[PDB]
Ligand binder design. Structure first.
Ligand SMILES: CCCCCCCCCCCCCCCCCC(=O)OC[C@H](COP(=O)([O-])OCC(O)COP(=O)([O-])OC[C@@H](COC(=O)CCCCCCCCCCCCCCCCC)OC(=O)CCCCCCCCCCCCCCCCC)OC(=O)CCCCCCCCCCCCCCCCC
Ligand SMILES: CCCCCCCCCCCCCCCCC[C@@H](O)O[C@H](CO[C@H](O)CCCCCCCCCCCCCCC)COP(=O)(O)OCC[N+](C)(C)C
Ligand SMILES: CCCCCCCC/C=C\CCCCCCCC(=O)OC[C@H](COP(=O)(O)OCCN)OC(=O)CCCCCCC/C=C\CCCCCCCC
Ligand SMILES: CCCCCCCC/C=C\CCCCCCCC(=O)OC[C@H](COP(=O)(O)OCCN)OC(=O)CCCCCCC/C=C\CCCCCCCC
Ligand SMILES: CCCCCCCC/C=C\CCCCCCCC(=O)O[C@H](COC(=O)CCCCCCC/C=C/CCCCCCCC)COP(=O)(O)OCCN
Ligand code: SF4
Ligand code: SF4
Ligand code: SF4
Lengths: 70, 303, 99, 156, 210, 176, 96
């Protein structure tokens, strides 16, 4: 009957699942467990560069909180 | 790990277009009171693999007099463009984030016709060249209205960034804000990919088939993101991914349904359809969508 | 750089996979044995080119809407669309869209 | 050793691929084409075997000659056969294609399509029922399964 | 079938059309002269091979007219019943292949299911699915089996809905209209002069039916 | 009596005009055809599982030929040559002579199954029910030569299929 | 409802002698239906019917895995049915 179409569609679905999620997970892995910082307009690029310089490890996602104010 | 991301975007799309062929056969078979392939594999699941193996094993028919250069270039360009279209799309987060993502997709679609042109010119046959000319004319004609409809829709988004379309539609889909433009977009995406009722036209042949089916799936993903805005929660993006994929699958099965449902247009009939029914209404609705945010003081944020 | 790498990967995969498709069946042994120039096609190509140019003019509309001169921008946008419609109407009435 | 095992397995894979997706073109010359279309109907549904309906001559695997072959038609049949990729087979359907049949003693009829092209399977009948043609297609599939190209190349 | 067509085109418009036929000329008429009347009956099954018993009926009527005999009433009723069944078969084939060539292709399957049922009716009566050779120049070859009329009635009381589904797919569809409406117009005088008959006459308004 | 198929006049009042315009703009008949195809997807397919399931046949079905014989074990054919005289396609060749016991029996009985048109005239001309056209239809062949049956092949066919051939003749002979 | 069709699927799995027989019939006959056994054949064929299926699908045969001299696990064809079961299976009679 018609539900025998569902297997193949499922496989298709699984394939279309893989890219999106993968990107998200990779964006979590390469940005310290948080969302990848998007930078249009060149002001928030400046913010990213300032974060990179402040971190001291040359990584923008290594955040320095209030405990670093001394 | 960017190469892993590129590969994890590319390979699943090729597998999905391999199994779309199987799904299409199954859906048309059941719409025609029969069954699709259900012998090769448990439920026809090994049919795409057998198809691919047979095609890649069969002898290729080189014209023996054609320009080998363009003959091989056309499938390369077609498949490369079909794969490149998937880079910009946000599912929820895009592989490549670009400021002018929509315009990039339009530019790649615009290039997509050189494969048709070069294949027709390199076939060394008058009739094949004439067919390629008709196909190219139809393609450019409908991509005109695609561009106009797309900018008219993006007038409620504020930019060409694809990601913002997720923010624009957190409370309501864009299908409700402009359904006429959505209907016209759907028809023009039918006519772009040479699908019914607009389909008037071994190795490299499989390449072209792969590129065309990937283009269809990407067109549906673009349509789902543009008009059917899924809810995105930053702390669990897989929900957005599932919604977006389900909507894309529904729209692709809608192409298959339309193919099984309808006769096909004549060439002059579809050209007249565009130039005398879609273009005037597209211009009218572009005017309406320029005016509307100003009249209602609902201009989108980003500038 | 990321976009360059992505394009290079896409084109490289397409090239290699087309090449394996075109050389796998050539390792085994086998037998190995105009004028008319329709004017309407040229006319539709030219019409597409002209409408494409006017669409290029219309493309900066999403950013045009934040100007503080909303009346002037609205007048100019509607004027461009009026001329688009006028071009379409003129080509329609002079039998330029027939087959 | 393993040299014969690997070629046997690879040949099995290639045979399964080739016979699990047969794309035919049909010269619907005469009324045997009606039973050919009834084999594509819902009841028998050739597509469910991987045998698609009406493939192009350029990407067709098997030629099905279903109908009377006249002298005026034989050059076109041979030309279309000549323009098929190499792993190609011919199926003769019905009496007219098999040996001339009811028009055997006619001045304008070719006394069998095998005077023109080599034929792999003969399907007898006037017309062969759609089920008989399906049996012939499956017999051709078994014949393909029986062939062994890599072993022959290995031993030569 | 198989057709060769030579056409002179100016643009897209067809300026001249010339069909070349004879690709299926087997020489039936000359071969008939070497057979008896019974031996020559089966050729008419193959003549128009979508409406078989209609050709059989025409041949039988001619031979009966020359023989100065008439079939029994039940034979005539069976002949007319199977002629109407054959008309259903032919019209299904014609309409659905017309749609298929246009590009619809779904009613083709929908109605070849019914065509297979009618082939089963042909098979039950004569042992052959299409070339029955059932209608002879003296009546019919054999009587109906004891359950045939019930099955014919059962088949025929659902067929109207199949026609209705075909009409839903085709009749009002605007693409079908624009493919078919005002195409191939023929006037009544030109239809009569050119030797047309059947629907080709009645499509132009001529009231004629044999 | 006659009917008009296309002699309808569209109503020109505002409501009808608006209905036609709404059909043109919103594609109502296109959606209705979509609905028809959708409904047709959700019903059971008519496909049978060949070769594990078979299409229905009849006792009158014509198939591969056979030569029958009497219950005593002697062949029915008496070389009367009526099947050869009536064959529309001239597929039957027969040669006979007196047997060692004076019996009238064939020495050659060939059917060219590539000339046969499976009309059944041969089995209805035979007065002793010797030649029959039996139920078998799955006998496709890989060479042209195996479709030229001689007397041994047809006798083997008869001895192979006798049970079902006799059952079908029993079911159908009262209609002849 | 939907739970009912699921239970019918599970009964259909169980009626083939377990998962092994279920997969055997799935990969051999491309169909896993269960019907009443009608008869056994001296060559090993099994015959089943189910009067609730529509005409054509209401009788079927499971071919043997070894006929006269060849392995018939995959290479099955319709010429393997003996004439009496041939007459029953092709619906020329109601009497097995
Ligand atoms: C939906 C999710 C899956 C269940 C399903 O589709 O049921 C449809 C089923 C439709 O009924 P039908 O198929 O027309 O009735 C035929 C009998 O059920 C015929 O019953 P049957 O004896 O053929 O049942 C065989 C059984 C077992 O089938 C199998 O195991 C093979 C298919 C496995 C697929 C994986 O199929 C199932 O019950 C599983 C359904 C498919 C699940 C995927 O009922 C519904 O679920 C309706 C839901 C609302 C739809 C809108
Ligand atoms: C991962 C690397 C990829 C490299 C390229 C390879 C492409 C992908 C490889 C995967 C292919 C899948 C093969 C699965 C085939 C099994 C199908 C099975 O059902 O066949 C059965 C048995 O068929 C054959 O006996 C099995 C042949 C399968 C292949 C044998 C060994 C191949 C392994 C080689 C792998 C090495 C790859 C190296 C090259 C790159 C019976 O089917 P069949 O009889 O037909 O149909 C009868 C239908 N009935 C039953 C209803 C009557
Ligand atoms: C093929 C397409 C070529 C161009 C693809 C890239 C287009 C694009 O918009 O990406 C630009 C991207 C990001 O810009 P935005 O999205 O606007 O955001 C910036 C703020 N973060 O920046 C870059 O392009 C950097 C790299 C540029 C160098 C390479 C550009 C592409 C050149 C293509 C050369 C290949 C042509 C060979 C022949 C082609 C025949 C079809
Ligand atoms: C969706 C996924 C699909 C994947 C895409 C397709 C994957 C491709 C897999 C390739 C499978 C291997 C193909 C090998 C069979 C090629 C065809 C063949 O059998 O030809 C036999 C041919 C006949 O030659 P002769 O008998 O001497 O001359 C006869 C003419 N007078 O013999 C050969 O030449 C053998 C060719 C070398 C093959 C040896 C190894 C097998 C292939 C290895 C894998 C190839 C890709 C890596
Ligand atoms: C108070 C403020 C209001 C502001 C104004 C807004 C009001 C808008 C009201 C009217 C808008 C309606 C316009 C919709 C588009 C109509 C275009 C059209 O009419 O084209 C058709 C043709 O369209 C087609 O037939 C295309 C068919 C192609 C096959 C597709 C089948 C359709 C069903 C598919 C489902 C569509 C799915 C859309 C949603 C997808 C979401 C992504 C006309 O063709 P003809 O009848 O031949 O007329 C020519 C002579 N006059
Ligand atoms: S082979 Fe027999 S059934 Fe087929 S067209 Fe010729 S006469 Fe008719
Ligand atoms: S088979 Fe019958 S009709 Fe033919 S020669 Fe023998 S006895 Fe006579
Ligand atoms: S069935 Fe007809 S053509 Fe065939 S042998 Fe008998 S009489 Fe001759």
């Amino acid at each position: 009957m018609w539900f025998e179409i569902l297997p193949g569609i499922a496989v298709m679905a699984a394939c279309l699942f893989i890219p999106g999620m993968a990107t998200a997970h990779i964006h979590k892995f390469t940005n310290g467990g948080k969302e990848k910082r998007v930078a249009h307009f060149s002001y928030q690029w400046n913010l990213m560069e300032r974060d990179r310089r402040i971190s001291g490890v040359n990584r923008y996602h290594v955040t320095k909180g209030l405990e670093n104010i001394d | 790990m960017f190469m892993i991301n590129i590969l994890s975007l590319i390979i699943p799309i090729l597998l999905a277009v391999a199994f779309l062929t199987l799904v299409e056969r199954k859906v048309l078979g059941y719409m025609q009171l029969r069954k699709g392939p259900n012998v090769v594999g448990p439920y026809g699941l090994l049919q795409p693999i057998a198809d691919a193996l047979k095609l890649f094993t069969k002898e290729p028919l080189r014209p023996a007099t054609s320009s080998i250069s363009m003959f091989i270039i056309a499938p390369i360009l077609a498949l490369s463009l079909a794969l490149t279209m998937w880079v910009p799309l946000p599912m929820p987060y895009p592989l490549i984030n670009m400021n002018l993502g929509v315009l990039f997709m339009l530019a790649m679609s615009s290039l997509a016709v050189y494969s048709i042109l070069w294949s027709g010119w390199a076939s060394n046959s008058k009739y094949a060249l004439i067919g390629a000319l008709r196909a190219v004319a139809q393609t450019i004609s409908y991509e005109v209205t695609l561009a106009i409809i797309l900018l008219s829709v993006l007038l409620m988004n504020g930019s060409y960034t694809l990601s913002t379309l997720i923010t624009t539609q957190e409370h309501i889909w864009m299908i409700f804000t402009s359904w006429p433009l959505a209907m016209m977009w759907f028809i023009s995406t039918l006519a772009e990919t040479n699908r019914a009722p607009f389909d008037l036209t071994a190795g490299p042949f499989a390449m072209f088939f792969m590129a065309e089916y990937a283009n269809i799936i990407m067109m549906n993903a673009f349509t789902a993101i543009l008009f059917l805005g899924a809810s995105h929660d930053p702390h669990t993006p897989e929900l957005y991914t599932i919604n977006f994929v389900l909507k894309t699958l529904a729209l692709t099965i809608t192409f298959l349904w339309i193919r099984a449902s309808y006769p096909r247009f004549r060439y002059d009939q579809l050209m007249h359809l565009l130039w005398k029914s879609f273009l005037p209404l597209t211009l009218a609705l572009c005017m309406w969508h320029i005016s509307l945010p100003i009249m209602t003081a609902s201009i989108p944020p980003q500038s | 750089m990321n976009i360059m790498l992505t394009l290079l990967t896409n084109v490289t995969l397409a090239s290699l996979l087309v090449l394996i498709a075109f050389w796998l069946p050539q390792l085994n042994a086998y037998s190995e044995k105009r004028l008319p120039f329709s004017m309407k096609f040229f006319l539709v190509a030219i019409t597409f080119l002209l409408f494409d140019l006017e669409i290029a003019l219309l493309l900066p509309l999403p950013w045009a809407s934040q100007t503080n001169n909303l009346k002037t921008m609205l007048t100019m946008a509607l004027f461009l669309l009026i001329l688009l419609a006028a071009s379409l109407a003129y080509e329609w009435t002079q039998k330029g869209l027939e087959w | 050793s393993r040299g014969e095992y690997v070629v046997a397995k690879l040949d099995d894979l290639v045979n399964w691929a080739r016979r699990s997706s047969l794309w035919p073109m049909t010269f619907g010359l005469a009324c045997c084409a009606v039973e050919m279309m009834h084999m594509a109907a819902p009841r028998y549904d050739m597509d469910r075997f991987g045998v698609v309906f009406r493939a192009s001559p350029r990407q067709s695997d098997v030629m099905i000659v279903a109908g009377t072959l006249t002298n005026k038609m034989a050059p076109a049949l041979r030309k279309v056969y000549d323009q098929m990729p190499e792993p190609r087979y011919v199926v003769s359907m019905g009496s007219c294609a098999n040996g001339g049949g009811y028009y055997h003693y006619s001045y304008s009829v070719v006394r069998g399509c095998d005077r023109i092209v080599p034929v792999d399977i003969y399907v007898p009948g006037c017309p062969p029922t759609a089920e008989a043609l399906l049996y012939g297609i499956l017999q051709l599939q078994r014949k393909i399964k029986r062939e062994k190209r890599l072993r022959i190349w290995y031993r030569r | 079938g198989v057709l060769r067509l030579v056409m002179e085109l100016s643009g897209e418009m067809v300026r001249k059309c010339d069909p070349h036929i004879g690709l299926l000329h087997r020489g039936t008429e000359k071969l008939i002269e070497y057979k008896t009347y019974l031996q020559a009956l089966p050729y008419f099954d193959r003549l128009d091979y979508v409406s078989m018993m209609c050709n059989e009926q025409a041949y039988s009527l001619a031979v009966e007219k020359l023989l100065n005999i008439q079939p029994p009433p039940r034979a005539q009723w069976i002949r007319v019943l199977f002629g109407e069944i054959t008309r259903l078969l032919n019209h299904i084939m014609a309409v659905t292949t017309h749609a298929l060539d246009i590009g619809a292709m779904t009613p083709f399957f929908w109605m070849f299911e019914e065509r297979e049922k009618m082939f089963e009716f042909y098979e039950r009566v004569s042992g052959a699915r299409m070339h029955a050779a059932y209608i002879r120049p003296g009546g019919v070859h054999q009587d109906l089996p004891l359950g045939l009329l019930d099955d014919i009635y059962e088949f025929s009381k659902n067929f109207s809905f199949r026609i209705d589904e075909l009409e839903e797919m085709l009749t009002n569809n605007r693409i079908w209209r624009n493919r078919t409406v005002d195409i191939g117009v023929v006037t009544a005088e030109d239809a009569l002069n050119y030797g047309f008959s059947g629907v080709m006459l009645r499509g132009s308004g001529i009231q004629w039916d044999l | 009596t006659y009917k008009f198929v296309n002699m309808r006049e569209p109503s020109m009042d505002m409501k009808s005009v608006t209905d036609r315009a709404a059909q043109t703009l919103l594609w109502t008949e296109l959606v209705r055809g979509l609905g028809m195809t959708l409904s047709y997807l959700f019903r059971e397919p008519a496909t049978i599982n060949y070769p594990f399931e078979k299409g229905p046949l009849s006792p009158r079905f014509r198939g591969e030929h056979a030569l029958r014989r009497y219950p005593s074990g002697e062949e029915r054919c008496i070389a009367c040559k009526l099947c050869e005289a009536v064959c529309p396609a001239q597929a039957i060749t027969i040669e006979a002579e007196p047997r060692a016991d004076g019996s009238r029996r064939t020495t050659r009985y060939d059917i060219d199954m590539t000339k046969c048109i499976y009309c059944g005239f041969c089995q209805e001309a035979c007065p002793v029910d010797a030649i029959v056209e039996g139920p078998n239809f799955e006998f496709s062949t890989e060479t042209h030569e195996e479709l030229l049956y001689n007397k041994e092949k047809l006798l083997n066919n008869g001895d192979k299929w006798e049970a079902e051939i006799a059952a079908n003749i029993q079911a159908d002979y009262l209609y002849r | 409802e939907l739970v009912q069709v699921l239970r019918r699927g599970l009964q259909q799995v169980s009626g083939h002698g377990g998962l092994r027989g279920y997969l055997r019939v799935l990969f051999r006959a491309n169909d896993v239906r269960v019907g009443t056994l009608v008869g056994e054949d001296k060559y090993g064929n099994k015959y089943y019917e189910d009067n609730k299926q529509f005409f054509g699908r209401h009788r079927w045969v499971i071919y043997t895995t070894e006929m006269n001299g060849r392995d018939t696990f995959w290479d099955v064809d319709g010429s393997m049915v003996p004439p009496e079961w041939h007459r029953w299976l092709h619906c020329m009679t109601d009497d097995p």
